Structures are given as C-alpha cells and as structure tokens.
Amino acid sequence: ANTRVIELFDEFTDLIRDFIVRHEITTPEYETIMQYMISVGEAGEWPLWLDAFFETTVDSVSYGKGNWTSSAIQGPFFKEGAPLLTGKPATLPMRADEPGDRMRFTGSVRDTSGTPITGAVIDVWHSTNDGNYSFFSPALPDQYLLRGRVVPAEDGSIEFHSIRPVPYEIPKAGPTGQLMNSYLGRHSWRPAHIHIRITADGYRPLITQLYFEGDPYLDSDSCSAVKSELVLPVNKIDIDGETWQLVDFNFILQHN
Amino acid sequence: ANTRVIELFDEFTDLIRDFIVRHEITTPEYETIMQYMISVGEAGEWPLWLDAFFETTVDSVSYGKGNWTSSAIQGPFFKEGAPLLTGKPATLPMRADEPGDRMRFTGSVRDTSGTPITGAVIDVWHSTNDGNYSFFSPALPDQYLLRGRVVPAEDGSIEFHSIRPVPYEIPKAGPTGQLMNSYLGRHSWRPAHIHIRITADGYRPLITQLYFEGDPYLDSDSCSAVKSELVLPVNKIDIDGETWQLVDFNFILQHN
Ligand SMILES: Oc1ccc(O)c(O)c1
Ligand SMILES: [Cl-]
Ligand SMILES: [Fe+3]
Numbered sequence: 001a002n003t004r005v006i007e008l009f010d011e012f013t014d015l016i017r018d019f020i021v022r023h024e025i026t027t028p029e030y031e032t033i034m035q036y037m038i039s040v041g042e043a044g045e046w047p048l049w050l051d052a053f054f055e056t057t058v059d060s061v062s063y064g065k066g067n068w069t070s071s072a073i074q075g076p077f078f079k080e081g082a083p084l085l086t087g088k089p090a091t092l093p094m095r096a097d098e099p100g101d102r103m104r105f106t107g108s109v110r111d112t113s114g115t116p117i118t119g120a121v122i123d124v125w126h127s128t129n130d131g132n133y134s135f136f137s138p139a140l141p142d143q144y145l146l147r148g149r150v151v152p153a154e155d156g157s158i159e160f161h162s163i164r165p166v167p168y169e170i171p172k173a174g175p176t177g178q179l180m181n182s183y184l185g186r187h188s189w190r191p192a193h194i195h196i197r198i199t200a201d202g203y204r205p206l207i208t209q210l211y212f213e214g215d216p217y218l219d220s221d222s223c224s225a226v227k228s229e230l231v232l233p234v235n236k237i238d239i240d241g242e243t244w245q246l247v248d249f250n251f252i253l254q255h256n
Numbered sequence: 257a258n259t260r261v262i263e264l265f266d267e268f269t270d271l272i273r274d275f276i277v278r279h280e281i282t283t284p285e286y287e288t289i290m291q292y293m294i295s296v297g298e299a300g301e302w303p304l305w306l307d308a309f310f311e312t313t314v315d316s317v318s319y320g321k322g323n324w325t326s327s328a329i330q331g332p333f334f335k336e337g338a339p340l341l342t343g344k345p346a347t348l349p350m351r352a353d354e355p356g357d358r359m360r361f362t363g364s365v366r367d368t369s370g371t372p373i374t375g376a377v378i379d380v381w382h383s384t385n386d387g388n389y390s391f392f393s394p395a396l397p398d399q400y401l402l403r404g405r406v407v408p409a410e411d412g413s414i415e416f417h418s419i420r421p422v423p424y425e426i427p428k429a430g431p432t433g434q435l436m437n438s439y440l441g442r443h444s445w446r447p448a449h450i451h452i453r454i455t456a457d458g459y460r461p462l463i464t465q466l467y468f469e470g471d472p473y474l475d476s477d478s479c480s481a482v483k484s485e486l487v488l489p490v491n492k493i494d495i496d497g498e499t500w501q502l503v504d505f506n507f508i509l510q511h512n
Pocket of ligand 1: 304307308446
C-alpha cells in the first residue's frame with residue numbers, strides 16, 4: 001500500500017540512521033547485528049522474537065484500555081479448527097494423567113450493559129505443565145490437546161476444566177534465548193498463563209491471556225505482556241490427592 | 257551480559273515501541289512486516305537490504321574525512337581469498353567473451369606523506385554487465401570472477417585491466433527490490449562502481465568504491481553511497497583500433 005508504507009519507512013529509516021549515528025555503531029557492531037538477525041531467520045524465530053518484544057504494543061494500539069475486557073498478545077501459538085466441547089463439565093482434550101494441579105475456570109460473557117452474549121464461541125489453549133504447546137512440540141502429538149472451543153450458557157456463564165498451566169521458559173538455546181538469557185543477561189521465562197480468543201457474530205473479536213497471583217514472573221515477563229487487570233485471584237482447593245486450582249473471570253465485549 | 261548491548265537494545269525497543277504507537281501500527285500491518293522480515297531471510301537478503309538502507313550511516317561514523325581517501329560502504333558482495341593477479345597487464349578473472357567495454361585502471365597507493373605504500377594489496381570486485389556478482393548469484397558459479405588482488409609496483413603504481421562496470425539493479429524480484437521498486441515506487445539502481453579494499457602493514461585498511469562521471473544514477477543511488485570525491489573521469493582513449501575505457505585513481509592511506 002504505497003503511501004502508508006512510504007510514510008513509515010522513511011520515518012523508520014531516519015529513526016535507525018539517527019540511532020546508528022548517536023551511538024557511533026561501528027562496523028563490527030553492524031556486522032554482529034546483521035549476523036544476529038540472520039541467526040533468528042535461520043531458526044524459526046521471527047514471530048517468536050517479534051511477538052516477544054513488540055506485540056504487547058501492537059496490541060495496546062489495536063484495542064486499547066477501557067471497560068471492555070482488556071485484550072492481550074495473541075502469541076505465536078494459536079491453532080484454528082479446535083474442537084467444539086460439550087461434555088459433563090466440558091473438559092479440554094488432554095492425555096491421561098496429564099500432570100500436576102487440576103484447574104477450574106468459571107466466568108461470564110456479557111456486553112457493555114451486562115446482557116449475556118449467547119452467540120459467543122470461545123477458543124482457548126495453553127501450554128502443558130511441562131512448557132510445551134502441542135502443534136509446536138516434538139514431545140507432543142500434532143493434535144488438539146489443551147486446546148478447545150467452548151460455548152456459553154444462555155444464562156451468560158461458562159466453564160471448563162484443564163490442568164494448571166505454569167511458567168514457560170522460551171528456548172534457552174534460541175537466538176531469542178541467547179539475547180534474553182546471555183547478552184541481555186536476564187531470563188527467558190513467561191508467567192503461567194492461558195490464552196483465550198472469543199468470536200461472536202455482531203461483536204468484535206477479542207484475544208487475551210490470564211495469569212496467576214503469586215506468579216513469580218509477573219513483574220518481569222520476557223514478553224512484557226502482563227496487564228494487572230488480567231491477573232487471576234487463585235483459590236487453592238485440596239480435593240484430596242489431586243490439589244485443584246479454581247479461577248473465575250468475567251468477559252465484557254467490544255460490541256462493534 | 258553486555259552493557260553496550262544492554263543500553264542500545266533497551267533504547268532500541270522503547271523507540272520501536274514509541275514508533276508503533278504514534279503511527280498506529282495495526283496487527284495486520286505488524287503481520288505483513290513479520291511476513292516481510294521472514295521472506296527477507298528466506299531470500300538470504302539481510303546483508304543486501306541492510307547495507308542498502310544503513311551502511312552509508314555506519315560508514316560515516318567509523319571513518320573520517322581528511323587528506324586521505326574517503327571510504328565507502330563495503331556492500332554485501334565482498335569475498336575473502338581473491339587471487340593475486342600478476343600479468344603482462346594484470347587482468348581480473350573473467351569468463352570468455354565476458355560482455356562489456358574493456359576498462360583499464362591505473363593509479364597508485366601512497367601515504368599522507370606522499371611515499372608509495374609498496375606493501376599494500378588491493379582487493380577489487382565489481383558486477384558483471386549483467387548486474388551479477390560471483391559467489392552471490394545462482395546465475396554465476398562460486399568462483400573468483402571479476403575479483404582479484406592487485407599489488408603495486410616497486411614505485412607504488414597500480415594497473416589492472418578488466419570490463420567496465422555498468423549500473424546495477426537490485427533484483428526487482430527480491431524482497432528488497434520489491435520494497436524499493438513496487439512498495440516504495442522508487443527504483444533499485446546503483447551506478448557502475450568498482451569496490452576497492454586496501455590493507456597494508458602500518459596502515460588503517462580502506463574500503464571504498466569508484467564511480468564514473470556521467471553515470472546516470474550518480475545523483476540517485478539506491479543505497480545512496482556516492483561521494484563527489486570518488487567519481488572518476490572516464491577517458492575513452494582507443495588502442496589497436498579498439499575501444500578502451502581508461503580510469504585512474506590515486507589512493508592515499510592513513511597510518512596506524
Ligand atoms: O548495497 C549494495 C548493493 C549492491 C552493490 O553492488 C553494493 O556494492 C552494495
Ligand atoms: Cl585470505
Ligand atoms: Fe503462550
């Protein structure tokens with residue numbers, strides 16, 4: 001689109017060139033940068049690397065604060081074609097003895113006023129206790145597991161159980177890992193989270209994630225994605241052997 | 257941990273983050289970028305694209321103007337290992353019936369004091385008429401074509417023969433070319449240039465380029481790397497009833 005790209009480019013160009021000058025970026029520097037950017041290309045990191053530092057912001061622009069439910073970063077992990085789920089307590093598809101703490105999510109889907117949005121479909125997915133997002137892991141089938149679509153009751157409410165997601169270290173060994181881990185000498189962890197997308201004819205898509213109080217990497221997310229409005233109050237319930245974690249959330253929507 | 261790296265990178269990201277924001281960079285735009293960035297690596301174009309937009313700027317910090325020869329950007333197409341050329345007249349390795357006007361290059365290398373620098377070796381590389389560089393074109397073989405190393409005579413003069421470069425167009429079909437030609441509605445032409453590198457014990461290495469007077473793209477370089485001081489007159493002075501191009505430059509080197 002010619003005129004828009006023309007605008008941004010030139011301004012982008014000047015921005016970097018000015019960055020190069022003010023910091024007298026030398027040739028070996030240039031060369032390391034270029035080398036590095038090649039690295040990222042050579043592995044599959046661009047959506048990873050870009051989503052890590054920049055989408056939080058591409059996000060803040062696209063949907064922006066206010067009394068909706070706040071969006072959050074989509075991530076390089078979504079997968080279309082999730083199953084419609086409808087069972088006893090409507091569970092995410094998971095292996096047997098999928099490990100560690102069991103989880104319960106409860107909530108609403110109402111519009112500005114507060115009137116339940118019946119025609120909502122609602123995708124959700126999240127990483128195994130073990131840091132792996134199926135479809136993106138040698139360890140895991142290329143199937144629907146901890147992924148799935150859920151419909152709201154006409155009363156408003158929704159429910160699903162899954163397992164409790166936990167802190168994920170982005171590949172220590174990736175260009176992004178090295179950048180986060182070694183050169184910047186910080187860490188490659190995100191807080192425990194659950195990604196969520198919500199369609200509805202006649203409203204505006206929403207895409208967000210939720211995290212957990214007492215989450216050690218809340219203040220320090222690698223991907224600077226955590227808004228506070230989206231940290232989950234967490235009830236640790238001990239239904240014998242299997243310790244459960246229950247969580248509640250009320251979604252409100254854009255509404256075209 | 258790298259504090260240069262810490263400091264530049266944080267600023268780098270805050271800028272980009274600023275940039276995204278003031279310009280309302282929308283998700284679809286974001287993705288097109290990512291898609292672009294990716295397709296740049298796939299075309300192995302980082303060192304193309306990057307040098308085209310930024311090497312001019314890195315060049316100007318990390319080497320200064322003065323009574324020695326002005327440097328210029330290296331570009332993506334340098335190769336280490338070109339052969340020493342020693343000859344009746346030294347001649348760059350060239351395919352049979354290699355298309356273009358026969359060019360004859362003369363000059364010298366001396367120091368800021370006037371003394372010939374007899375210990376210098378001069379790398380030279382330029383494109384084929386056809387606008388291709390060896391080792392960087394699937395249309396030429398990975399062998400040293402139109403690359404070689406000349407050394408000056410005891411009296412410090414240099415001479416090589418070769419074909420005379422012509423204006424070069426970054427392939428319109430690349431991601432880089434597509435950006436420049438289509439997306440920005442500009443062109444992607446550089447003027448005929450000869451890349452030079454001089455190294456010599458005692459001296460700071462020089463990498464530069466030589467342009468030709470009249471060169472139609474002179475006032476309009478895609479990479480925007482021409483410098484008036486580096487535009488050689490061309491003397492079309494014929495011999496054996498055949499059409500030579502005569503070009504002469506005197507190199508001057510800084511000490512250390
Ligand atoms: O950025 C560039 C592109 C093409 C060239 O021939 C060159 O020397 C530099
Ligand atoms: Cl060598
Ligand atoms: Fe995730």
